[PDB]
């Protein structure tokens, strides 16, 4: 839920683009990657 969140590159569910690891809104693209059980570390920067 709320793990030590660092800086990363991703696109929010609204089309934004900031640091994200496990915020809340699971953007469609990231949703698939995260839904698989993997963290943002895969798409980190």
User: At residue 39, what are phi and psi to the nearest 5 degrees?
Assistant: -90, 175
Please give the tally of structural domains in the chain. Answer: 1
Spatial separation of the C-alpha atoms in residues 14 and 4, rounded to whole Å: 23
**C-alpha span between 33 and 39 (Å, rounded):** 8
DSSP state of 31: H
Question: C-alpha angle with apex 43: 39 to 45, nearest 5 degrees?
Answer: 125
Spell out the long-range contacts of 21-30 with Cβ–Cβ below 8 A and sequence spacing 24 or more: none
**What does the alpha-carbon distance between residue 39 and residue 1 come to, in Å, rounded to a whole number?**
11
SS3 content of the chain, % helix, strand, coil (to 5): 25, 5, 70
Method: NMR
How many residues are recorded in the chain?
Answer: 45
Name the residue range of residue 23's domain. Answer: 1-45
3-state secondary structure of 9: coil
Contact 6, 21 (CB under 8 A): yes
């Amino acid at each position: 839920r709320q793990p030590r969140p660092a800086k990363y590159k991703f696109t929010d569910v609204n089309g934004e683009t900031k640091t994200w690891t496990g915020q809340g809104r699971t953007p469609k693209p990231i949703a698939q990657a995260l839904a698989e059980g993997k963290s943002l570390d895969d798409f980190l920067i």
